[PDB]
C-alpha cells in the first residue's frame, strides 16, 4: 500500500518514426495520451544538488 492506494499505473513508451502509424486496440484499463512529444534540439543532462550560477 503506497501512500494508501494499492493500485498502480505503469507507463510504456515508443518512438514512432515519421510517416508511421501506431494502433491502440484496447478494452479498458487504458491511460490514453492526449499529446505526443517531439524532441526540439540537443541538450545536456546532469544530476546534482548544488546551487545554480
Amino acid at each position: 500500500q503506497v501512500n494508501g492506494l494499492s493500485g498502480r499505473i505503469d507507463f510504456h513508451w515508443l518512438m514512432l518514426n515519421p510517416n508511421d502509424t501506431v494502433t491502440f486496440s484496447f478494452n479498458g484499463a487504458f491511460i490514453a495520451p492526449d499529446r505526443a512529444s517531439f524532441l526540439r534540439g540537443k541538450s545536456m543532462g546532469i544530476q546534482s544538488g548544488v546551487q545554480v550560477d
Binding site: M44, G45, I46, Q47
Partner: protein, 55 residues
C-alpha cells in the same frame, strides 16, 4: 570527448548491471591513466632530446 550518463545516482540501476558498469568504468579509467602518464612521459623525453639538439 563529450559523454552523457548511463547510470544515475538517484534511482540506482539494478545491482548486478550497475556493478558491471562500475567495473568497466574503472578498467577504462586505468587504461586512460596509463595513456596519460605515457603520453606526458614521451612528450617530455621528446622535449628534452629536442632542446639539446637545437643546441
Amino acid at each position: 570527448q563529450q559523454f552523457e550518463l548511463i547510470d544515475n545516482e538517484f534511482n540506482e540501476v539494478e545491482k548486478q548491471i550497475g556493478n558491471v558498469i562500475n567495473w568497466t568504468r574503472d578498467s577504462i579509467t586505468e587504461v586512460w591513466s596509463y595513456n596519460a602518464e605515457l603520453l606526458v612521459a614521451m612528450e617530455n623525453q621528446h622535449t628534452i632530446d629536442l632542446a639539446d639538439s637545437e643546441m
